[PDB]
Amino acid sequence: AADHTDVLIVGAGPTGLFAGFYVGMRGLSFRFVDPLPEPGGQLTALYPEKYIYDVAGFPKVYAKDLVKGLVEQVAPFNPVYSLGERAETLEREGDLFKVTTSQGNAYTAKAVIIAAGVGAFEPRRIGAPGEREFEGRGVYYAVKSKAEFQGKRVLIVGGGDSAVDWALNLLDTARRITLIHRRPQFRAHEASVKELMKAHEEGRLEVLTPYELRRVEGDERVRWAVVFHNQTQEELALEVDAVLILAGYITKLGPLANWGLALEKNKIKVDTTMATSIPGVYACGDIVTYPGKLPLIVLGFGEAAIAANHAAAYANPALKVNPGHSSEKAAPGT
Amino acid sequence: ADHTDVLIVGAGPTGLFAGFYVGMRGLSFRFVDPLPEPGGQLTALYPEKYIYDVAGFPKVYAKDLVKGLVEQVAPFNPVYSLGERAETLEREGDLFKVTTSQGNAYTAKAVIIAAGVGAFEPRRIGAPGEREFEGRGVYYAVKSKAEFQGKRVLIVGGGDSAVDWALNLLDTARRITLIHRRPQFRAHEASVKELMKAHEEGRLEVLTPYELRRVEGDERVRWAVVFHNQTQEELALEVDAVLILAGYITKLGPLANWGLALEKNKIKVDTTMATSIPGVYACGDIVTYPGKLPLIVLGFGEAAIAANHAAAYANPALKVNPGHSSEKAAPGT
Ligand SMILES: Cc1cc2nc3c(=O)[nH]c(=O)nc-3n(C[C@H](O)[C@H](O)[C@H](O)COP(=O)(O)OP(=O)(O)OC[C@H]3O[C@@H](n4cnc5c(N)ncnc54)[C@H](O)[C@@H]3O)c2cc1C
Ligand SMILES: Cc1cc2nc3c(=O)[nH]c(=O)nc-3n(C[C@H](O)[C@H](O)[C@H](O)COP(=O)(O)OP(=O)(O)OC[C@H]3O[C@@H](n4cnc5c(N)ncnc54)[C@H](O)[C@@H]3O)c2cc1C
Numbered sequence: 001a002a003d004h005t006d007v008l009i010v011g012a013g014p015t016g017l018f019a020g021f022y023v024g025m026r027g028l029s030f031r032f033v034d035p036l037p038e039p040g041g042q043l044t045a046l047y048p049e050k051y052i053y054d055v056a057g058f059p060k061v062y063a064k065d066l067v068k069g070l071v072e073q074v075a076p077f078n079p080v081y082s083l084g085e086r087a088e089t090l091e092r093e094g095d096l097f098k099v100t101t102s103q104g105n106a107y108t109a110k111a112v113i114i115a116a117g118v119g120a121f122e123p124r125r126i127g128a129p130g131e132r133e134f135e136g137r138g139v140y141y142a143v144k145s146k147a148e149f150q151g152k153r154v155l156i157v158g159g160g161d162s163a164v165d166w167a168l169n170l171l172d173t174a175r176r177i178t179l180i181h182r183r184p185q186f187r188a189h190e191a192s193v194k195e196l197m198k199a200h201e202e203g204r205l206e207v208l209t210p211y212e213l214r215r216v217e218g219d220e221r222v223r224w225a226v227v228f229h230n231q232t233q234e235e236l237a238l239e240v241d242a243v244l245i246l247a248g249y250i251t252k253l254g255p256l257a258n259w260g261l262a263l264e265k266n267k268i269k270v271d272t273t274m275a276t277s278i279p280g281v282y283a284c285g286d287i288v289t290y291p292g293k294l295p296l297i298v299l300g301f302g303e304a305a306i307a308a309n310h311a312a313a314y315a316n317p318a319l320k321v322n323p324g325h326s327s328e329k330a331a332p333g334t
Numbered sequence: 335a336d337h338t339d340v341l342i343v344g345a346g347p348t349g350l351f352a353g354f355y356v357g358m359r360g361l362s363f364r365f366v367d368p369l370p371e372p373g374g375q376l377t378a379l380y381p382e383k384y385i386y387d388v389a390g391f392p393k394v395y396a397k398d399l400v401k402g403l404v405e406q407v408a409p410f411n412p413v414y415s416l417g418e419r420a421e422t423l424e425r426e427g428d429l430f431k432v433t434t435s436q437g438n439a440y441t442a443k444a445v446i447i448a449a450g451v452g453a454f455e456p457r458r459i460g461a462p463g464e465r466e467f468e469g470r471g472v473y474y475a476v477k478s479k480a481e482f483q484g485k486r487v488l489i490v491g492g493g494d495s496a497v498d499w500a501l502n503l504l505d506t507a508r509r510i511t512l513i514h515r516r517p518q519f520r521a522h523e524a525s526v527k528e529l530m531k532a533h534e535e536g537r538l539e540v541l542t543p544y545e546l547r548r549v550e551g552d553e554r555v556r557w558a559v560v561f562h563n564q565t566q567e568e569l570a571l572e573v574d575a576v577l578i579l580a581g582y583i584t585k586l587g588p589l590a591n592w593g594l595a596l597e598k599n600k601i602k603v604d605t606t607m608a609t610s611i612p613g614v615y616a617c618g619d620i621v622t623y624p625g626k627l628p629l630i631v632l633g634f635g636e637a638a639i640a641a642n643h644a645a646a647y648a649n650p651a652l653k654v655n656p657g658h659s660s661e662k663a664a665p666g667t
Contacts, residue, residue: 018389018631025387047660054358054659056351056634057388057402063660069390272605273625292606292639294655298351301389302635306625322627326387327380327396 001105005029006315008109010087013041015285015300016115017070022308024077035086036121037142040067045121045249048161055297076333086120090259110315113307114283119251130216138222139243146173155225157213158246161188164196171204180211180227264289274307282307338362339648341442343420346374348618348633349448350403355641357410364413366420369454373400378454378582389631409666419453423592443648446640447616452584463549471555472576479506485574488558496579497521497529513544549576607640615640
């Protein structure tokens with residue numbers, strides 16, 4: 001896979017999404033690359049269920065709903081979402097930039113916007129014997145396709161908003177679902193939770209709390225999983241074909257430290273036009289640093305607007321940086 | 335009271351958000367703006383239009399974004415000192431003193447300048463008698479309908495404001511005469527059609543392209559002279575009121591006398607949004623730096639930076655970084 005776009009954006013968190021929106025507003029093509037399986041960054045991975053109060057114009061808005069808003073806002077420009085992939089290398093070849101992903105893919109772009117946040121997200125492991133051994137052979141950390149779980153007996157581990165959703169989404173395809181969580185309350189939206197417990201009572205699936213994963217067993221592939229009551233230590237052996245670990249994602253500075261960027265305390269140094277030390281490469285959001293920089297969504301959006309328009313002008317010299325009043329233009333997409 | 339921790343010049347979108355954040359840091363604040371309502375350019379210039387590049391809003395009417403910001407600021411009991419313009423900015427020890435066009439004097443520990451492109455003020459025609467009878471028959475806004483109940487009114491202007499009020503006073507005034515210096519009105523198309531319908535029905539006089547020559551009166555307005563700006567033909571109209579709704583203009587004005595380091599009428603700021611004067615921060619269209627763009631979304635970011643740094647300036651016990659709002663109590667309680 002070597003697709004090309006005018007601009008490639010590292011990170012599909014809130015700032016990356018808005019940057020993509022503006023790149024789209026300037027008439028350019030753009031691709032989002034992020035190891036997280038969906039858009040939203042920290043909002044989606046760490047607190048989708050919580051209200052945010054300091055985003056301009058929203059007296060109150062759920063992190064999950066803000067993401068939905070941003071996704072819908074970028075949609076008219078038909079973005080290319082290359083999620084589930086981490087940007088490993090950033091190289092310049094002639095008039096283009098080449099980025100190779102953790103999936104072996106090689107995308108190119110005329111300009112690059114780095115909205116990497118505090119680092120690349122990756123599934124957190126449970127640490128149970130057999131978990132690591134059977135990864136790829138019955139142990140999963142993401143659902144790439146529901147067919148992968150067709151007629152399968154599945155054990156889902158997790159208590160976050162993501163585990164709740166996948167348990168429900170799979171009732172549609174899995175033979176049997178069993179979900180364990182270390183405590184009674186889930187950190188997911190109340191409605192979704194009520195929907196899950198309803199399915200439990202209906203016998204559509206099985207929810208066990210407070211339970212944790214002791215170990216995964218198999219031969220050539222997963223055959224069983226042993227879970228345990230974290231208080232009484234009583235164990236339960238479940239016959240399963242797959243173990244879907246959805247215990248959240250964690251961040252690591254990662255690859256971006258190897259791109260030859262001017263950094264300061266693991267943050268990307270930028271001037272006021274959001275340009276990094278490398279020409280044609282811009283940044284915005286939690287990943288940048290400058291005097292007065294605050295790790296806030298509201299500032300991240302403003303930084304994205306700046307990065308996107310300067311990157312746009314860099315990728316297409318026929319464009320001025322200032323975009324003009326959106327209110328005086330045709331609705332996005334036309 | 336007369337004092338607040340921070341005084342914010344301008345109640346536009348960036349001023350409002352800056353106010354919100356100062357509030358979030360537990361400080362008192364006051365907005366000073368000649369406009370009677372908050373909103374700045376969105377309120378004064380394009381309230382009915384959809385905005386598409388405000389983060390998180392696939393589309394939002396300018397007027398609605400303003401009401402969202404006002405509701406967002408509300409819980410921190412803002413002091414809305416609207417209807418007055420900041421004329422002077424002085425510092426006495428550890429206080430900043432601001433006197434307004436209304437003779438008032440306000441004080442604060444820190445100031446945020448969110449002046450946009452200048453102070454808004456109704457556009458004047460410049461006709462003899464216009465300024466003379468202002469407040470005695472000549473108006474630049476509609477306080478209420480009863481103000482024009484049963485009166486003969488000459489309305490001047492060709493935008494949404496002039497057209498809407500001419501239509502909205504038809505059942506209030508004894509007679510309305512609407513004039514505009516251009517042949518065509520430039521208000522919403524639906525409004526223009528309604529105006530033409532009312533005119534065709536004989537509900538009011540509409541004269542274009544006409545202008546105000548002069549306003550006459552004794553202790554109040556009694557007559558007005560208007561003229562066709564092509565044929566130069568004049569017409570004397572017997573009226574009890576002259577309602578001028580010809581739009582707004584902005585004036586850098588007093589801001590050029592505050593001692594701030596400017597650059598082409600714009601306030602120079604560093605990345606923390608501090609101006610050349612310690613204790614004075616700025617944000618929005620009024621500031622300048624490489625890469626600055628006249629966008630609302632960027633103005634909000636600049637306002638967050640100025641509000642938090644201004645707050646730390648007013649209360650040195652506060653850390654500039656406010657921390658996550660989502661991990662604190664909802665605004666207000
Ligand atoms: C619990 C919590 C509560 C918060 N509450 C608030 C609040 O109320 N208000 C507020 O303003 N802020 C809040 N924040 C901060 C806010 O979440 C961040 O400011 C915001 O997420 C930054 O957005 P971003 O797009 O810059 O980066 P992020 O959302 O962090 O997204 C960066 C993305 O880029 C990806 N990425 C990184 N490196 C690579 C690579 N090499 N290749 C590909 N992809 C990569 C990541 O996987 C990630 O998805 C909170 C944070 C937390 C943890
Ligand atoms: C999608 C989009 C569409 C846009 N469309 C338009 C458009 O159609 N037309 C347009 O003109 N702009 C447009 N803009 C620009 C936008 O309106 C401005 O960027 C924004 O209004 C700036 O906000 P502000 O708070 O900095 O200042 P402003 O909204 O200009 O507000 C400044 C306020 O401070 C007050 N003030 C100034 N000096 C003083 C003083 N000395 N004492 C007291 N009060 C004072 C003013 O009276 C005013 O109310 C658009 C922007 C975007 C992102």
